[PDB]
Every structure is written in structure tokens, then in C-alpha cells.
Design a protein around this ligand. Sequence first.
Ligand SMILES: [Ca+2]
Ligand SMILES: [Ca+2]
Lengths: 306, 98, 48, 78
Amino acid sequence: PYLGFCPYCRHSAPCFSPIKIENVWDESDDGSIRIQVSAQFGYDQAGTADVTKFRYMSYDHDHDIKEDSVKKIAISTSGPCRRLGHKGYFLLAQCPPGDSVTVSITSGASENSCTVEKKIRRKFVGREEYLFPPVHGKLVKCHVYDHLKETSAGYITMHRPGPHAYKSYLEEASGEVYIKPPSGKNVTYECKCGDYSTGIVSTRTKMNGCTKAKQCIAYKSDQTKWVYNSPDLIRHTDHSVQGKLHIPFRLTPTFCPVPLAHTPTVTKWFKGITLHLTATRPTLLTTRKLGLRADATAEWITGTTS
Amino acid sequence: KFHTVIPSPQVKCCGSLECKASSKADYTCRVFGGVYPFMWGGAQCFCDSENTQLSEAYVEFAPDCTIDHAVALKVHTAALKVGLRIVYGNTTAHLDTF
Amino acid sequence: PGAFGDIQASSLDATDIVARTDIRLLKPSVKNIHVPYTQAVSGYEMWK
Amino acid sequence: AKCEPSQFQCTNGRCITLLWKCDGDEDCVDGSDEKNCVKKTCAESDFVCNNGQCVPSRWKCDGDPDCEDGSDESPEQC
Ligand SMILES: [Ca+2]
Ligand SMILES: [Ca+2]
């Protein structure tokens, strides 16, 4: 559960949106897409796995883990998308094609969003494009993101979070920086306050040796929970991998229906055939000669033709 | 499809950083000074100027590669196997042979 | 970089991965922390 | 000079984004964003969020973010 900087947000400038699409995948044969973000879904602040709610890094001076119901997560491209499932750092949804994919917390006035200028196309499996799989048709081998969130596609790891200094943690009264930790926080401070200095303080503290905030940084020992390897946080001085998490929605072999355009009316003539063709959508007509030469031929036929 | 992985940057805000090697595929890290990076909380370094920053990049197989992968293979000296059905007189038999 | 065989290994689960991608990292030319970089379009997909 | 931020040189010789001058961040050793910009800090008729963006407080329970801070969604009031 962390913060992240994304190229585009609810407001057209780039912003440190709590939700940040870190990666996308599209190898599904159904138009579903796997999305990896900076927020976790199906877990409580405590890390219990209540599927009804999701958590993320609090977007304020005092950073903690806040919670909300997954019903407020909208995924969109050219239009809204049916969410097929969610788990941890990842979501699975079926979206129409578009040049971008957007994740948005639609919490009314807490509406924030992340968009990646990543294209998605209405790809299809088989040999005949379709707007939607028909029923009078052959079942063919295809692969789709298994909706069972317990299925694992693989794993990508995480590390203990690195420092995350807060300007709000320092005050410059008296012309020397005061560390002003939030209540009860075991804040950890470091500063080249005239010289390299570090320490931990659980309460308001007066520094010595420097007169501007420019040199002093202050954060807290929030290592208690790990953070994804993404760039928006600086790594801990030891970034050795902290275990792993299973990527949900395994790409699984399955079967998919595909159309069978009206049987081509063959016309026979001397050492040659005329295929009469009638297709509403691009149909991959392919032929080869069984001779020594294959004379490989392939053409995306469309409409009525021969 | 190679999945580019850019690990979280490392910063030694007031000193040097080694551009050491690693075994990762196309591991191409480089070091840059004057980074003075801001995080959401604000400034994120000890020094105003001598802040060296290490940027890292390498690649691994994307998760979907378990299905979307392809394997290149050299192939040679192909041997033809065959299934035979033999019928002779009142007797019929089926066979397979290289 | 940018052609079939962009990334290669003996097994998909293997850590023994070798690759060439023309990856180059640019200066963090923005106040917000970032790691700007570029590379050749996945040669495998370009091939596809 | 013109440089990577397209905008003003601070007196240490670093080039700085003038788009950063009003942001409340000293981005430089010297001169460093201290020079004036208009931030009226309007009457409480307007709420002001945390970045200081004046917005009519009547929208502090509208269900639409009035500022990028999102402070108008404050549970205490809404
Ligand atoms: Ca500034
Ligand atoms: Ca509002």
C-alpha cells in the first residue's frame, strides 16, 4: 500500500495519485486486461483479506493506511468496464478497445484517478474477427485471464519501503529547524544540519547546526509493511527482496466460440476453382497447393466477393 | 514480451554511488547527480547539490509469457513415422512404423 | 534490440536471462522523483 | 539563460522552473522561490483547501472535488 506518481490524473496535470497503474497486460483472448496499481484491493488496513474493501496510502501529511469499498473503483477506457475480479495490487476487467486505460476512485469529492497512455485493442482469437462471440460456431482453443482471483499468473516482489520525508514534519521557528512529529509517531530524522546527523524522536525536537529546511528531512520507521518495487518510492538502503506476492488471474488455456461464415459456394472449372465468398467481418481465407511448391496464399476477405 | 523492470531508485544524497555490475538481463544502471528529488511528502535528500542518484533498469519475462512465449528450435534430419493398416485375405491388421 | 529474440533464456522460469534492448536511462529531468528511460519496442511483439 | 526548466536562473546559477516559483518549495541554494506571488487567502466565505486554492465552501459536501487537495471531502464536515 503506497503512493505513486502517474502521468495523468483527475486533473490534467501529473500527480502523486495514491492509485498508480504500474503495469498492464492484455494477452487475454477476451479483451480482459490485468492491471497492477499502487493500491491494494480485497484487504483491510490491518491486512486481513476482507474482499469487500480495499486500502491505499493516505494522501495527507500524516501517512497511514486508509480503507474504502471496492465498489468505488471504476476502470475505464473509451467507456466503463466490467470488473471481473480484484486482489491485492491487481485488478482484472473487460474493457472495450482504446488508446488509454484509466483507474479511478469515484468517491464523489474524493475522486482521484490514474491514466496510462497504453493502447488496448479489441483483439480476437480464431480466424474471423467478431464484435462479440456468436453461438452458431465452432469452439476453438484460446487463453483468457482466469476470473478466479486465487489463480496465480506469477509473482513480482516488494521491498521494505524506503524513507518518505514529509515537509510537514519540520518547522523553522527560532531560525533553526524543529522536528514536529505527529502525535505518538516514532519519527526518524536525518539532516546535514551543518554536518551529517540522524536520530529517532517520538516527540517535538529542536535541531542544531542549520537554519533552513533545505538540509533537513524527516520520516518514520514505517518499514512495518512492505511496498511494491515500483519507482515512485525510493528504495530502502537495503532493498533485498521481502518475499513475494502471487499475481492474480492466471492466464489459462480454455475454449472460445468463433463464427463460421456461410459455407463458401465453390464453383469448379478446368484446373481451377472459384470460391464464392460472403463474410460480414474480416475472414482469413488461406490456401496452399499440395505440390512441391506450396504456393502459400492468405487474404483477409471482407464482404461479398470471389 | 520483455517486461522492463526499473527498480526503485537509490540515492546517497551527499556522496558517491557505485555503478556496479549485475547478472540481470541488459542490466544497465547509471548514476546521475543533482537529482534533488521531491516525493509526495516533499524534498527527499540530505544535500542541496551533491545528491547523486542511481537509476536502474533490467528486463524479465512478463507474467503472461507462460502462455504468450515462443520457443525457437533448430530442427534437422526429420524421420517419417507412419500408421499402417494392412488388409490381406480374410485378415486385417493395423501397424505403426518409423 | 527491437527484433525477434529481444529477450532470451533457456527456460521461462529461469533467472538465467540474457537480453539486448537498447535500454538507456535519461537524467531525472523533473522535480518529482522519476526514472525516465526509453528502449526498443519489444522485438518479440514487433515480430508478432 | 534558457535551459532544461525553460525558465528563471536562481542566483546560485542553477536554472529553475518559474512554474515552481509560486509553489512554496525553495528549489535552489540562493534566491530559491522566495520572491512574491499572489495567494490572496480568501475570506472564509470560500474554503481554501490545503494548497491555499480558494473554493466556495458550499461545495465542501457536494460530491465533486473542488481542489486537487480533495480536502472538500473531509469526513468531519461531509
Ligand atoms: Ca518551487
Ligand atoms: Ca466539492
